[PDB]
């Protein structure tokens, strides 16, 4: 009694604790990476460290060459924080899905992506490192006397739900030198290691962000919001820290990147993610089908395959907002299906067929003469902030709500029974359910996911 957390005083307001215990905090402003903690550690950016969209602005993109790195030179006042005392490392991480091929080829090649490690004699290294090995995420802590402690996290086999499978995920690693190290992903505890009794950790004066010892020349990773705390955060501090970055400003695609205009997306319903969207016929309705899947018992990985089903495109309802291409919640849009190299608008015909005069059946490319076709939508995010999904609100042409886009299981004509896309206001009265049929993933083609 005894506490190796840095002293704050403020033991109440979580936000005050998070702020006060921050000793390093990378931000990207006007395309320059710097430390905004207040300790002013210097940050050197090498020529092939690239910038990409991030969870809230831009983020760091590392490729596999020696010019692709970011080095933080620790300020003198924070230099020895982890020698004996507690600390927390946090950052957003995006790693592409490893191919079956590359798991076999490179699966035993452990490579670092962030490190303070130092080499000392006796063969001894000292510091901490974040590294990857196949679909393992690994935290290593080493003291100056040769002790080594580690957490090895094995990712989920279902790569649609896995953390090292091309989505932005939030990492947090807490170190309490009087108990354990704990690894969290998206605020949830994934692994722990006891770390008591360690000696002095004598690490590098620099913290290096770079792929180290990676044998796959085409490998890359992205890192955002890299931050270090002089405290071992508790689960409630971690939850607030995690949710604090979920900016309400832009909507997000399936991978966590900002949603964009003029971009092909495949839709998948969150509440039935094994399904793809199909079209009966131009001018007619859409429905769900089962996605085909990939399975590999040898390598223990599997996943519903992506990029089957219709391609959708979002356009501004009222053109020319020049430079920006990002969709903001509350934006008014037109939804198209691109088919036969033609774009076909999505909407509901006045008095069109509906189920129980209340679930409105959507039509693609409808064009009956003299029949209004309602197609003005609002792209919104009403629920589940941790989930990268979107809702779509359809209006008539008089500001009345025709409902959120969803599905309805039923039959049209003598067709087979199907989950058919619809707009319904029924969803507004149920926005608090765990799972809801109006939640959609927007999935664009991405080099970080190829089907095997
Ligand atoms: Au690699
Ligand atoms: Au919903």
From Swiss-Prot:
Q: Which cysteines are joined by disulfide bonds?
A: 214-230
Protein name, as recorded: Tetanus toxin heavy chain
Species of provenance: Clostridium tetani (strain Massachusetts / E88)
Of the intact sequence, the residues represented are 865 to 1315 of 1315
């Amino acid at each position: 009694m005894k506490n190796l957390d840095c002293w704050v005083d403020n033991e109440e307001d979580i936000d005050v604790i998070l702020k006060k215990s921050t000793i390093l905090n990378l931000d990207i402003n006007n395309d320059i990476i710097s430390d905004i903690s207040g300790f002013n550690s210097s940050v050197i950016t090498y020529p092939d460290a690239q910038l990409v969209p991030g969870i809230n602005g831009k983020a760091i993109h590392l490729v596999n060459n020696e010019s692709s790195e970011v080095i933080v030179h620790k300020a003198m006042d924070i230099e020895y924080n982890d020698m004996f005392n507690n600390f927390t490392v946090s950052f957003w991480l995006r790693v592409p899905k490893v191919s079956a091929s590359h798991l076999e080829q490179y699966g035993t090649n452990e490579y670092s992506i962030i490190s303070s490690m130092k080499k000392h004699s006796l063969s001894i290294g000292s510091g901490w490192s974040v590294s990857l090995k196949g679909n393992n995420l690994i935290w290593t802590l080493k003291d100056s006397a040769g002790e080594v402690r580690q957490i090895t996290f094995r990712d989920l086999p279902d790569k649609f739900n896995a953390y090292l499978a091309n989505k932005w995920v939030f990492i947090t690693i807490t170190n309490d030198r009087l108990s354990s190290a704990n690894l969290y992903i998206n605020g949830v505890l994934m692994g722990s290691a006891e770390i008591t009794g360690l000696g002095a950790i004598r690490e590098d004066n620099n913290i290096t962000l770079k792929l180290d010892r990676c044998n796959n020349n085409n490998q890359y990773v992205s890192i955002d919001k890299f931050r270090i705390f002089c405290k071992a955060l508790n689960p409630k501090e971690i939850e607030k820290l995690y949710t604090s970055y979920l900016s309400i400003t832009f909507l997000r695609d399936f991978w966590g990147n900002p949603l964009r205009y003029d971009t092909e997306y495949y839709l998948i319903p969150v509440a039935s993610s094994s399904k793809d969207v199909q079209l009966k016929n131009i001018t007619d309705y859409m429905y769900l089908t089962n996605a085909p899947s990939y399975t590999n018992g040898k390598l223990n990985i599997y996943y519903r395959r992506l990029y089957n089903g219709l391609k959708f495109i979002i356009k501004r309802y009222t053109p020319n907002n020049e430079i920006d291409s990002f969709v903001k919640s509350g934006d008014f849009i037109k939804l198209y299906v691109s088919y036969n190299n033609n774009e076909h608008i999505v909407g509901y015909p006045k008095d069109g067929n509906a189920f129980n005069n209340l679930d409105r059946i959507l039509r693609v490319g409808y064009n009956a003469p003299g029949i209004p076709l309602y197609k003005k939508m609002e792209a919104v995010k009403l629920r589940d902030l941790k989930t990268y999904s979107v809702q779509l609100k359809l209006y008539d042409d008089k500001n009345a709500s025709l409902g959120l886009v969803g599905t309805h299981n039923g039959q049209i004509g003598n067709d087979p029974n199907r989950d058919i896309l619809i707009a319904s206001n029924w969803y507004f009265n149920h926005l608090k359910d765990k799972i809801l049929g109006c939640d959609w993933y927007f999935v664009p083609t991405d080099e970080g996911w190829t089907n095997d």
